[PDB]
């Protein structure tokens, strides 16, 4: 199944979890984009005094990300694989509209959106379409249209936490090999050489000035009130 | 030299696509050359001139023709790319040949690949062969005389 | 080995002296960018009065440095010493990002970067980023991405103070040489000549109207408080 | 000397005199820019009151003046009168950005120029 033409889905759900299908919300594309874009932001803190040559740079924030793609309806007659209707695109963007965009009175929101394609997999948001339509029946009825789209990106907070695994709050173990020392492990771990005394009376240690090269030490954590 | 050589009888061979014989023999071979990209600038209070600056060496593509062959190697080659994008660069030489069919001077073509096949038009009132024309995109050559 | 073509490398770090390496986390590239470009601010204080023809004008600071430069990702098979991979071009963005954007949790930020390539050496870290994808296999599989990069400049605080050497308020000596005076002598090193008593009286010199074309001298800052 | 081709230097200054000159502090380049450019600019009051038909006009500054030009760095070789250098234009760029962008822990600031 190397040789299959593999074409974009997106599905709709109803949790923040992802595992609600919204029913009859999944919609299939009949001509893939061509390209998509991503976008990354991380923001800083530059605030510096007058005299001096260079600022202290501080870390405040990771923005969120961006995705970007255009998608074109086409059911004039000559793609392969495909049959002409007799009202055109109509059903198409009707059917794209409500899966994307409409109102979910049953949230009281628009829907969660999980976007894939071969390697791809987005979760998020709509913000913007636009869609311009192009060729027309005697009759008025549409058979060509073209849509850019813009979608943001949504992680859930229990996620997120789990996912900056935070961790002089939490305790730590190690294993001596040959060529440590206390202070300078303490320094690693810590920051700071000076707690060397307190990690060497909460492991029981009198020589602590040799360490042998097979021992488990643990780190405890500094007290917080 | 005292009197320089003709160009009528050269012979191309191929590297990486197994030989045949008639894979070997072309109407014609063009595209052996160079030249070298420049920027120009001009400096105040100089008036005589602009200078020039080199930036890159260019090369354009090898092409070859033939009467037309149903059963060739390097269009089998050809096809992989053209049909499936399946691309494995050859390497090739270009000989120019002396009266007891040695080269006087060769061409040593550096990673090349398919860009272009075509057969020329088909003429129900005309007296003609059909030919074959291939064009393949290299990376650089070097000589050897 | 001057004829072997160096490849730019990006290597991430823990600490703000640039000594702990984060396992893992080099990048090297597998084709150079054409070029590279650096940008410089001072800035000025330039408030004057009405009715004047000119300004007096006062340094400020030094604004931070920023580095720019563009990537290409390509794993199609016609670039000579490289081979197709099963997966494309997935892996290599995917260790990309882990190096100069993901958070890290046991430092609560991302990470501190070096970026080296021939005479460049560059620290600091990551602004902006915008990867765009444009060729793909049938399945779905990229194969070809070009990604534009914004990186800031970081120096610690330790160290702007000591290429600052910041120097009326240190200690000075001089040899005499012939044609020297003492108060010409005070006031390239005070702005001002009227000290050449003091500056006499802490050497011991009572004939300070003719120097001695060897002596060396003394010259302490002014008090404080 | 009417024939000889002079080249742009610019030299760094402790003092707001122009007296004292930094040492080590002169960059001379080796290609004159194509030219350079100028900027002037008078500031003036404008208020007047309504169903007039013209403003009273009054002088208020003089803003200060602005010089800008480009410069090229090329040690490629083909440039009549100069050699190759083993690290091209490494101490060029180095000794260029020294006079004119570092900071002077004497004075507590960039350079005079």
Same mark, same amino acid.
């Not at chain 1, 969660?112 to 998020?124: E, H, P, R």
């Not at chain 1, 948001?125 to 009759?139: A, S, T, V």
């Not at chain 2, 030299?1 to 071979?29: C, M, R, W």
């Given at each position: 199944?190397?040789?299959?033409?593999?074409?974009?889905?997106?599905?709709?759900?109803? !949790?923040?979890?992802?595992? !609600?299908?919204?029913?009859?919300?999944?919609?299939?594309?009949?001509?893939?984009?061509?390209?998509?874009?991503?976008?990354?932001?991380?923001?800083?803190?530059?605030?510096?005094?007058?005299?001096?040559?260079?600022?202290?740079?501080?870390?405040?924030?990771?923005?969120?990300?961006?995705?970007?793609?255009?998608?074109?309806?086409?059911?004039?007659?000559?793609?392969?694989?495909?049959?002409?209707? #007799? !009202?055109?695109?109509?059903? !198409?963007?009707?059917?794209?509209?409500?899966?994307?965009?409409?109102?979910?009175?049953?949230?009281?929101?628009?829907?969660?959106?999980?976007?894939?394609?071969?390697?791809?997999?987005?979760?998020?948001?709509?913000?913007?379409?636009?869609?311009?339509?192009?060729?027309?029946?005697?009759?008025?009825?549409?058979?060509?249209?073209?849509?850019?789209?813009?979608?943001?990106?949504?992680? #859930?907070? #229990?996620?997120?936490?789990?996912? #900056?695994?935070?961790?002089?709050?939490?305790?730590?173990?190690?294993?001596?090999?040959?060529?440590?020392?206390?202070?300078?492990?303490?320094?690693?771990?810590?920051?700071?050489?000076?707690?060397?005394?307190?990690?060497?009376?909460?492991?029981?240690?009198?020589?602590?000035?040799?360490?042998?090269?097979?021992?488990?030490?643990?780190?405890?954590?500094?007290?917080?009130? | 030299?005292?009197?320089? $050589?003709?160009? @009528?009888?050269?012979?191309?061979?191929?590297?990486?696509?197994?030989?045949?014989?008639?894979?070997?023999?072309?109407?014609?071979?063009?595209?052996?050359?160079?030249?070298?990209?420049?920027?120009? @600038? &001009?400096?105040?209070?100089?008036? =005589? @001139?602009?200078?020039?600056?080199?930036?890159?060496?260019?090369? $354009?593509?090898?092409?070859?023709? =033939?009467?037309?062959?149903?059963?060739?190697?390097? *269009?089998?080659?050809? =096809?992989?790319?053209?049909?499936?994008?399946? @691309?494995?660069?050859?390497?090739?030489?270009?000989?120019?040949?002396?009266?007891?069919?040695?080269?006087?001077?060769?061409?040593?073509?550096?990673? &090349?690949?398919?860009?272009?096949?075509?057969?020329?038009?088909?003429? &129900?009132?005309?007296?003609?062969? &059909?030919?074959?024309?291939?064009?393949?995109?290299?990376?650089?050559?070097?000589? *050897?005389?």
């Amino acid at each position: 199944s190397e040789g299959k033409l593999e074409k974009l889905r997106i599905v709709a759900y109803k !949790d923040s979890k992802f595992s !609600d299908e919204v029913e009859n919300g999944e919609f299939i594309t009949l001509l893939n984009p061509e390209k998509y874009k991503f976008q990354y932001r991380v923001e800083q803190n530059e605030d510096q005094a007058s005299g001096t040559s260079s600022a202290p740079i501080r870390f405040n924030k990771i923005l969120p990300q961006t995705l970007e793609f255009d998608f074109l309806f086409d059911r004039t007659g000559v793609i392969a694989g495909y049959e002409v209707t #007799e !009202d055109g695109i109509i059903n !198409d963007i009707d059917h794209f509209k409500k899966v994307v965009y409409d109102y979910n009175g049953e949230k009281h929101k628009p829907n969660y959106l999980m976007i894939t394609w071969g390697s791809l997999l987005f979760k998020g948001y709509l913000k913007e379409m636009d869609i311009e339509y192009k060729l027309f029946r005697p009759d008025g009825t549409p058979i060509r249209a073209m849509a850019t789209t813009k979608i943001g990106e949504f992680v #859930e907070e #229990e996620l997120r936490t789990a996912q #900056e695994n935070n961790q002089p709050d939490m305790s730590h173990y190690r294993t001596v090999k040959e060529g440590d020392t206390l202070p300078l492990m303490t320094y690693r771990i810590y920051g700071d050489s000076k707690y060397y005394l307190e990690v060497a009376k909460a492991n029981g240690l009198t020589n602590f000035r040799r360490l042998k090269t097979g021992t488990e030490l643990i780190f405890p954590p500094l007290q917080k009130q | 030299t005292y009197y320089p $050589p003709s160009s @009528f009888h050269f012979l191309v061979e191929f590297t990486g696509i197994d030989a045949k014989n008639n894979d070997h023999e072309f109407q014609s071979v063009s595209g052996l050359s160079v030249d070298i990209d420049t920027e120009e @600038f &001009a400096e105040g209070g100089e008036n =005589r @001139f602009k200078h020039k600056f080199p930036v890159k060496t260019k090369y $354009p593509n090898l092409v070859l023709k =033939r009467g037309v062959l149903v059963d060739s190697k390097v *269009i089998s080659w050809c =096809r992989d790319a053209i049909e499936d994008f399946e @691309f494995k660069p050859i390497d090739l030489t270009v000989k120019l040949l002396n009266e007891e069919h040695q080269p006087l001077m060769t061409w040593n073509v550096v990673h &090349a690949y398919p860009v272009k096949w075509s057969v020329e038009d088909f003429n &129900a009132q005309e007296s003609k062969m &059909a030919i074959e024309s291939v064009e393949l995109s290299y990376n650089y050559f070097k000589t *050897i005389v």
